[PDB]
């Protein structure tokens, strides 16, 4: 009842945007994708004006993912299609670290919230690599059996990561003992393209089986399956907060689910065969960033 629609409050008309992410204060956001350019925008300027990024950093390869540092305001990590994981400073435009151990494209990077100098990546090379910004070599390496689409730190502790794998499972590791995952969550019927935490104990996933799923990582239980969107092929984006899940669709529509309800609360047609390619809630608010395969960016807000 609370929300029935997504309102468009701003649009930046346009290349696939692989990632759209807010900085630690939800003040700036960044986009990156196939055009090899990490762009930073001021959120309030975008909402209030009738355009230009405040930072543009060119890269050697297409980007798959961005993650802002949760403590250092100005630092943002990227993963790219060459496998390189880079930490950048958006004020100086410097690449601070270039981590080059992955042998194939890296699909994701994630900075830890609670140990903010730690970041984790996953790759088509089937490795999870944990990095520290004060060290050039990886700190932890997990050799897995299938391509890795996403790795995400638990929001409450840097000891736990969720790994979304092409083997259709979520592998939940305690990095203090990587011999076996704590638990492997089965239920998806295709690759797990995203994993995102709603809270310390609640994990969501997306898959190219056209479902989202919710899981309990305290008691290692399946919770719920969400359906309505079309996602059989692409990285279409997943973002969650304390109560809501949002994802893209190959129908060029953004979908929003409340975590207790298996069918969508609402959806938005972006306005061809375009796909939504990136989504990001503004923390626990009804406001969201979205982008699609044409490079269009929209700021949306859930509304009654």
């Amino acid at each position: 009842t609370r929300y029935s629609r997504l309102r468009v409050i701003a649009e930046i008309r346009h290349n696939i945007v692989s990632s759209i992410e807010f900085d630690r204060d939800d003040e700036l956001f960044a986009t990156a994708g196939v055009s090899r350019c990490i762009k930073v925008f001021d959120f309030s300027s975008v909402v209030n004006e009738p355009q230009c990024p405040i930072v543009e950093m060119s890269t050697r390869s297409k980007l798959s993912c961005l993650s802002w540092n949760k403590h250092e305001k100005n630092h943002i990590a990227s993963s790219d299609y060459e496998g390189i994981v880079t930490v950048w400073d958006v004020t100086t435009r410097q690449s601070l670290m270039e981590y080059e151990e992955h042998e194939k494209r890296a699909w994701s990077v994630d900075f830890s919230r609670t140990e903010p100098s730690m970041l984790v990546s996953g790759s088509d090379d089937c490795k999870v690599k944990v990095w520290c910004t004060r060290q050039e070599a990886s700190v932890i390496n997990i050799d897995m059996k299938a391509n890795i689409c996403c790795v995400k730190y638990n929001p409450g502790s840097s000891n736990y990561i969720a790994v979304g794998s092409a083997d259709h499972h979520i592998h939940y590791y305690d990095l203090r003992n990587i011999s076996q995952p704590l638990h492997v969550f089965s239920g998806h019927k295709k690759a797990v393209s995203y994993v995102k935490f709603l809270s310390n104990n609640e994990l969501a996933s997306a898959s190219t089986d056209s479902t989202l799923r919710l899981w309990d990582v305290k008691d290692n239980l399946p919770v719920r399956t969400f359906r309505g969107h079309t996602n059989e092929k692409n990285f279409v984006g997943l973002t969650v907060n304390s109560e809501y899940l949002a994802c893209g669709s190959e129908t060029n529509e953004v979908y929003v689910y409340h975590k207790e309800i298996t069918r969508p609360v609402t959806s938005h047609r972006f306005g061809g065969s375009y796909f939504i390619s990136a989504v990001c809630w503004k923390s626990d608010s009804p406001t969201m960033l979205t982008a699609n395969s044409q490079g269009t960016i929209k700021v949306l807000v859930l509304a009654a």
Partner: peptide, 7 residues
Amino acid sequence: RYAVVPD
């Protein structure tokens, strides 16, 4: 191919 999930 870009933004295509591994099988």
